[PDB]
Amino acid sequence: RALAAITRFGENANNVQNRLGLQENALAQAGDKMARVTELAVQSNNSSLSPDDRKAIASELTALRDSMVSLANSTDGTGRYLFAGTSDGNAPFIKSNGNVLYNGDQTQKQVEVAPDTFVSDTLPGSEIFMRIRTGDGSVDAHANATNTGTGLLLDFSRDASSGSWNGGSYSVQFTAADTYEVRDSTNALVSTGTYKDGEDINAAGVRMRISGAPAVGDSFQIGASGTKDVFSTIDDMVAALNSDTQTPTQKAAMINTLQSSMRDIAQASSKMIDARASGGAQLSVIDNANSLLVTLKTTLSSIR
């Protein structure tokens, strides 16, 4: 009846080991797909491309989003889902009204591979594909959707220039061609200043940089980064590339949208890379287990 326990520990160890190896490969391939998304997006800014060419790129991006879903729905060949957390009974990523939703859970199983010896199972898919910070990872900013001018959001960050950031959201709004106001989340007046094309705008511990010609009333929001799933980000690029771009206004809006999506993809690339690297020591410990060494624990290590 000790055979029963050894078998159970053995099978547990083999299962987690297989899953962890499949996770590592899946994160590598997600890396590659993200790198391909990044290249397609850079190319889509190219001013020589036609609307039709932009559409073909959008079509490739759609295919990449679809293959990222299949990857997110990888199985471990006992037929259990890799990225569902502990609810590894049904497909964790589902298409629903154009969004990809996560049906798995938030728990990374602690697999007991020997008495009081635990190995961390695969990450919940929420931690890989869904909970990806936006912007630069702590602040996010966008050109407002209703903007009528040609103001391009070039970059942004926390910045010690204007002092210290309180985590709050702000709005940079043009009141003349060469004048703007910054307002806080209650619409109170924080600062005003003179607009210079490509010069930093510093208020309340954050900075953004704008080029082109914002129209009167055009605004730019900035605030703490939230999270956005990888599928939505690819999706937004696809919808941006399908946009009409006949006027300077429409071109700026698409560029602003592409460029924001690209910042988010960079965050998505980093997550995959950072996630993969966070798992390597657990795989190395298992692989090198014999090099690193009579109880249940030692009898198990002597077989594997």
Residue numbers in the entry: 56 to 348, 353 to 363
Q: What does the study report here?
A:
To initiate filament growth, three junction proteins, namely, FlgK (hook-associated protein 1), FlgL (hook-associated protein 3), and the cap protein FliD (hook-associated protein 2), are sequentially placed at the distal end of the hook. The FlgL and FlgK junction proteins that are located between the FlgE hook and the flagellin filament are indispensable for the formation of the flagellum because both FlgL-deficient bacteria and FlgK-deficient bacteria lack functional flagella and are immotile. To investigate the role of FlgL in hook-filament assembly, we have determined the crystal structures of FlgL from gram-positive Bacillus cereus (bcFlgL) and gram-negative Xanthomonas campestris (xcFlgL). The bcFlgL and xcFlgL structures revealed that the D1 domain of FlgL forms a four-segment structure, irrespective of the bacterial species.
Crystal structures for the truncated bcFlgL and xcFlgL proteins (residues 45–251 and residues 48–364, respectively), which lack ~45 N-terminal residues and ~35 C-terminal residues, were solved by multiwavelength anomalous diffraction (MAD) phasing and single-wavelength anomalous diffraction (SAD) phasing, respectively. The bcFlgL structure was refined to 2.2 Å resolution. xcFlgL was crystallized in two different crystal forms, and we obtained two xcFlgL structures (xcFlgLC2 structure in space group C2 at 1.9 Å resolution; xcFlgLH3 structure in space group H3 at 2.2 Å resolution; xcFlgL structure refers to xcFlgLC2 unless specified). The D2 domain of xcFlgL forms a β-sandwich structure, which consists of a β5-β12-β7-β8-β9 sheet and a β6-β11-β10 sheet. Our comparative analysis of the two xcFlgL structures (xcFlgLC2 and xcFlgLH3) indicates that the N-terminal and C-terminal regions of the FlgL D1 domain adopt diverse conformations, as observed for flagellin. In the xcFlgLC2 structure, the α4b helix runs downwards as one α-helix. Moreover, the N-terminal regions of the α1 helices are tilted in different directions in the two xcFlgL structures.
